[PDB]
Design a protein around this ligand. Structure first.
Ligand SMILES: [Cl-]
Ligand SMILES: [Cl-]
Ligand SMILES: [Cl-]
Ligand SMILES: [Cl-]
Ligand SMILES: [Cl-]
Ligand SMILES: [Cl-]
Ligand SMILES: [Cl-]
Ligand SMILES: [Cl-]
Ligand SMILES: [Cl-]
Ligand SMILES: [Cl-]
Ligand SMILES: [Cl-]
Ligand SMILES: [Cl-]
Ligand SMILES: [Cl-]
Ligand SMILES: [Cl-]
Ligand SMILES: [Cl-]
Ligand SMILES: [Cl-]
Ligand SMILES: [Rh+]
Ligand SMILES: [Rh+]
Ligand SMILES: [Rh+]
Ligand SMILES: [Rh+]
Lengths: 122, 122, 122, 122
């Protein structure tokens, strides 16, 4: 799945996800969000199962983006957890956690949860 | 917070989290889970806000572990999203998503959610 | 939105969600899951904002199902949290938490997280 | 566990959770949050497994609060999903989803995720 994961992905929000999969299980690339306190590209890093089950199952993976680059700092970090599914319509189905740096008093409202679906098209 | 994040962390389950923070916002190290289908150390990678807010707020961060090493493969990947809080009792408060590689029929039950608290002690 | 919420809903899994909305904000009805350790109808209860914002926003709501009826007991309970969106294609977009009764040793893996979208059609 | 669940609970934020458990699996009561856009008591409803496993496991449960009462309307709703654990130090361990009514453009940032622990004391 190293070949299938590597490339440019887009989600339902119009965000752009460019990633290279290493043979070891490494994930490296850049993320560009279409929404939120974000501008241009952001460094991402993550991991994936380099030897997934051969019974029609998807490939587990995850990656992190800290929302600080040369243009902005949203003092937050998102992690995507999900699986890559190959085939004619390859997808990456994820759920995500967005944690914002806060004081201890505001910790209870520091984390957003959501889900993205990434496709190779559009 | 580069100095404060770098080092060995332990959670409420007795898991061991060893990480090096780069000046750029990079996170690299190894994870050892005390529970689940896991044995010995696993490669982790992640990101953190290298220039957090200076108003008593915590530092946002996240990291990924794919549960495959030389000993086992749980065909799953966990991402931790949360914040680092410094001070006399430094903590890393996280919430996590554990996605298991599954078929499309079993996708609905592929992801576990939970929370860990990491301390420098014990 | 009392009229719009009341009725039969279906999700992406083919589950059936029948609910009555009270003028007070009450939600009552039955749930039938197409997947998992579940059979026939299950009692649901929940709440919704009976006076939502009039600026094109959705109506916040939530409901609980304990997976015990006269046929089975999965020793688990799901809560859906999300919003109702009206219009020609009325939807209920949710995220859910499925907690399974476990021992303290297995608490870390007791909770599933996911998302459902409910429509009036199909 | 009907007797054990029924009563007044408090969480780590100092919120107050008063609930009556029905023999059928029903949960009814009021919630008072110590934080957020909330004031005084709010109606809650939920479900619990009335016949849990007798192997030292906890009792699965869930409840919903829509944050509208006679004093305020935060146009949001929280659902708690978790388990009740009996014994000398009875607890209710939960994870929660807080959905805010939003426009379709802001849907991605509509839901907060967190966790509360409820005890009978303090
Ligand atoms: Cl925006
Ligand atoms: Cl802008
Ligand atoms: Cl295998
Ligand atoms: Cl940087
Ligand atoms: Cl185990
Ligand atoms: Cl073992
Ligand atoms: Cl700042
Ligand atoms: Cl490897
Ligand atoms: Cl099934
Ligand atoms: Cl069956
Ligand atoms: Cl309003
Ligand atoms: Cl019953
Ligand atoms: Cl507040
Ligand atoms: Cl106030
Ligand atoms: Cl049983
Ligand atoms: Cl009301
Ligand atoms: Rh969706
Ligand atoms: Rh906890
Ligand atoms: Rh989806
Ligand atoms: Rh906690």
């Amino acid at each position: 799945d190293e070949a299938g994961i590597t490339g440019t992905w887009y989600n339902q929000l119009g965000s752009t996800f460019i990633v290279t999969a290493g043979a070891d299980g490494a994930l490296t690339g850049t993320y560009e969000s279409a929404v939120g306190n974000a501008e241009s590209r952001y460094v991402l890093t993550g991991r994936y199962d380099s030897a997934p089950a051969t019974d029609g199952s998807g490939t587990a993976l995850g990656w992190t983006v800290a929302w600080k680059n040369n243009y902005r700092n949203a003092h937050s970090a998102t992690t995507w957890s999900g699986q890559y599914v190959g085939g004619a319509e390859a997808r990456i189905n994820t759920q995500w956690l967005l944690t914002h740096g806060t004081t201890e008093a505001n910790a209870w409202k520091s984390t957003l949860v959501g889900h993205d679906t990434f496709t190779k098209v559009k």
